[PDB]
């Protein structure tokens, strides 16, 4: 229903705890939270967590 | 020989074997320092790059 931003990983990132989201370059992430401070939140393959906002690029809807 | 050692403030996980995973409290022996936010060091048998602002200088 509600609109949702989609981003694609520019680089690999490996989570250090369960509140962070791991991904490989190219993975498609559905964004749930955007905030200042270097981290955004999103979902990937049934997992949710925070990731570096500078590690992703936008996807044109 | 004098050596530079740093202590991890935060956890970091490698994305490949040229990078060094560590846990908060680990002491790392620095092997290379460069501009750009990445340093290289050795911990417990492995050597790799890691974020410089995840660690703090200590003394051996």
């Amino acid at each position: 229903s509600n609109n949702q931003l989609v981003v694609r990983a520019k680089f690999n990132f490996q989570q250090t705890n369960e509140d962070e989201l791991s991904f490989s370059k190219g993975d498609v992430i559905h964004v749930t939270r955007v905030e200042e401070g270097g981290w955004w939140e999103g979902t990937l393959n049934g997992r949710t967590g925070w990731f570096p906002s500078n590690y992703v690029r936008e996807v044109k809807a | 020989n004098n050596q530079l050692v740093v202590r991890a403030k935060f956890n970091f996980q490698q994305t490949n074997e040229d990078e060094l995973s560590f846990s908060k409290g680990d002491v790392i022996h620095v092997t290379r320092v460069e501009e750009g936010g990445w340093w290289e060091g050795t911990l417990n048998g492995r050597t790799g790059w890691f974020p410089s602002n995840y660690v703090r200088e200590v003394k051996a």
């Binding site: 401070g37 270097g38 | 460069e34 990445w38 290289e40 602002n53 995840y54």
Partner: peptide, 21 residues
């Protein structure tokens, strides 16, 4: 046997972990 390791990762380092107010 000190090997030759590569340059810094070409990507920027991740920021320090999130710490909300």
């Amino acid at each position: 046997g000190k090997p030759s390791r590569p340059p810094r990762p070409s990507r920027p380092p991740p920021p320090t972990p999130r710490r909300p107010a």
